[PDB]
Curated annotation (Swiss-Prot), chain B:
It comes from Western equine encephalitis virus. This is Spike glycoprotein E1. It comes from the Viruses. It is found in: Virion membrane; Host cell membrane. The chain holds residues 994 to 1090 of 1236 of the full protein. It is a single-pass type I membrane protein.
From Swiss-Prot, chain E:
The chain holds residues 994 to 1041 of 1236 of the full protein. Interacts with spike glycoprotein E2. The precursor of protein E3/E2 and E1 form a heterodimer shortly after synthesis. Processing of the precursor of protein E3/E2 into E2 and E3 results in a heterodimer of the spike glycoproteins E2 and E1. Spike at virion surface are constituted of three E2-E1 heterodimers. After target cell attachment and endocytosis, E1 change conformation to form homotrimers. Interacts with 6K protein. It comes from the Viruses. N-glycosylated. Class II viral fusion protein. Fusion activity is inactive as long as E1 is bound to E2 in mature virion. After virus attachment to target cell receptor PCDH10 and endocytosis, acidification of the endosome induce dissociation of E1/E2 heterodimer and concomitant trimerization of the E1 subunits. This E1 trimer is fusion active, and promotes release of viral nucleocapsid in cytoplasm after endosome and viral membrane fusion. Efficient fusion requires the presence of cholesterol and sphingolipid in the target membrane. It is found in: Virion membrane; Host cell membrane. It is a single-pass type I membrane protein. This is Spike glycoprotein E1.
Length: 98, 97, 314, 52, 48
């Protein structure tokens, strides 16, 4: 299972921001035109409609993935190995052969 | 996206994770700071719901499927041409018996 | 490296989609993540408040620290008997450390974290499907006394165990409208008593500075075109989608995620032994099941026609 | 919350009692999508509510 | 077992009750004192 990591939004919010390239898994970015974002405390910057917000979203491994995960395998020709119990005369021999 | 293997990595502790989970970033509507997003369901979870029964229960010839290493134990199929070179001392003279 | 010094970290305010009044609001107990991969029904919840620590950040099991609604940007401490988790009914608290709570919750369609009394009484409900989980091929409500022992993975009740880490970043700017006066036709910068506050204004020209007292600024007719936030802020906050990042948004430190998913042994029911009536080339199984029990068959030849069915009743 | 009955109770005092009636209360949503509680991000439609 | 009339008596106040409910006594698996058992469903309730 993936953990959608959304970082804290960046607002160079009197001016403009540019989408970059990152190696994080499924790194999605988007630049939004005029925002004027609010928090507990009112207006977060000064210019009215010259405000740009950058949305980032990539994907991680969930913390519980070290236990609940799957492994993808390719398996080639199989080999047979047997344990034999040859009893000849009054002597018993145990042995493994390919 | 939405199928098994939508997120892949060589190991769990790897820094080269590759993923494709269909993340669409939406234009914020509310005044409060927000990152509205939408995503496809976890392919791992979808496969877990639609995995079917394992090889431990769908195996032929009464095979016991075991892991670490992967093996199919105690399979009843076919014939094995064994060739034994019995030591000479085991045989006894026809006079002794 | 991963630190446990919570004096260097601070709680924050999030945007809860469902507060006490059933409307979105800024809350100190916002629910960030809910994890349910435990085979005994427990869940791990991440919150914007820090549990088990006092105001100063030193460990104190009976107290939790949260973000005040005040204009002075302070951190408040309250007792942990006021922390209540509910999914459909009340949930049993099994542990707490930092942003993380562990609870045993009945199945339900939502998760709630509340402060049940005091000044900071609120809630936070998020939509999560918490579903009943059972180990094995037999259904049960609670584990039986008699059964066979299998391998099941559960969340450790101890907070020292670590299941990963979370990245802690520098606190971003937090503009407060209380810091602007707008006296007559020109704006004034009013700090919260003697604390340094930085201003960013667009009164024709970009101007910035730090102030300890009242300031007239220059040519700002409206208070809309300037913002002010406290400079003292240096304690790290979580990488939350509800905060505005600093210009240096690098991973400054790391915190643990407690309650590791460890392997243990569970108690699982043993079903009633079937009655087998034998006829020519076949068997009949008389199966008594009070809860859904899985019957799996297969042939030991080349064809392995495999029946799987969940059986309830006789 | 949804349920099959409606109860009005006097939880304390001399006149502590109750009254239960059979009324079907079901979950209600607006639009073409099911939700448990309204989301932060969405589209603003016309819904009719009881003025508090 | 599991059908109507798995417990039969000439009267409700009789000391000669006869029954067949498929009681299976299991081996105690835990340390505390226990009598583990499993049983077929009540034929009377099934018929009901």
């Amino acid at each position: 299972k993936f953990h959608t990591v959304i970082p804290s939004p960046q607002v160079k919010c009197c001016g403009s921001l540019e989408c970059k390239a990152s190696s994080k898994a499924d790194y999605t970015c988007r630049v939004f035109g005029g925002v004027y974002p609010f928090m507990w405390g009112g207006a977060q910057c000064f210019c009215d409609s010259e405000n740009t917000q950058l949305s980032e979203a990539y994907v991680e491994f969930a913390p519980d993935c070290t236990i609940d995960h799957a492994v993808a395998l390719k398996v080639h020709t199989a080999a047979l190995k047997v344990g034999l119990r040859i009893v000849y005369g009054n002597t018993t021999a145990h042995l493994d052969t390919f | 996206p939405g199928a098994f293997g939508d997120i892949q990595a060589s190991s769990l502790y790897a820094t080269d994770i590759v993923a494709r989970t269909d993340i669409r970033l939406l234009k914020p509507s509310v005044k409060n700071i927000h990152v509205p997003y939408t995503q496809a369901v976890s392919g791992y979870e979808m496969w877990k719901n639609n995995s079917g029964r394992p090889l431990q229960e769908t195996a032929p010839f009464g095979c016991k499927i075991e892991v670490e290493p992967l093996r199919a134990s105690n399979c009843a199929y076919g014939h094995i041409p064994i060739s034994i070179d019995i030591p000479d001392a085991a045989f006894v003279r026809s006079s002794e018996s | 490296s991963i630190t446990d010094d919570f004096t260097l970290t601070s709680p924050y305010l999030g945007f809860c989609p469902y507060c006490r009044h059933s409307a979105p609001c800024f809350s100190p107990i916002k629910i960030e993540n809910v994890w349910d991969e435990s085979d005994d029904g427990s869940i791990r919840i991440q919150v914007s408040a820090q549990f088990g620590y006092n105001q100063a950040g030193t460990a104190d099991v009976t107290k939790f620290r949260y973000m005040s609604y005040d204009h002075d940007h302070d951190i408040k401490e309250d007792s942990m008997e006021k922390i209540a988790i509910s999914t459909s009914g009340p949930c049993r608290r099994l542990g707490h450390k930092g942003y993380f709570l562990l609870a045993q919750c009945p199945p339900g369609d939502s998760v709630t974290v509340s402060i049940t009394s005091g000044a900071s009484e609120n809630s936070c409900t998020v939509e999560k499907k918490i579903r009943r989980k059972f180990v094995g091929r037999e259904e049960y409500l609670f584990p039986p006394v008699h059964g066979k022992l299998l391998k099941c993975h559960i969340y450790d009740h101890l907070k020292e165990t670590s299941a990963g880490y979370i990245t802690m970043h520098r606190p971003g700017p937090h503009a407060y409208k209380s810091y602007l006066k707008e006296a007559s036709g020109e704006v004034y910068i009013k700090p919260p008593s003697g604390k340094n506050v930085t201003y960013e204004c667009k009164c024709g020209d970009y101007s910035t500075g730090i102030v300890s007292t009242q300031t007239k600024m220059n040519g700002c007719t409206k208070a809309r075109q300037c913002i002010a936030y406290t400079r003292d802020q240096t304690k790290w906050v979580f990488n939350s989608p509800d905060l505005i990042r600093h210009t240096d948004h690098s991973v400054q430190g790391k915190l643990h995620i407690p309650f590791r998913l460890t392997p243990t042994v569970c108690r699982v029911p043993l079903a009633h032994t079937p009655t087998v009536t034998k006829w020519f080339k076949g068997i009949t199984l008389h199966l008594t099941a009070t809860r859904p029990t899985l019957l799996t068959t297969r042939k030991l030849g080349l064809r392995a026609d495999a029946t799987a069915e969940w059986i309830t009743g006789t």
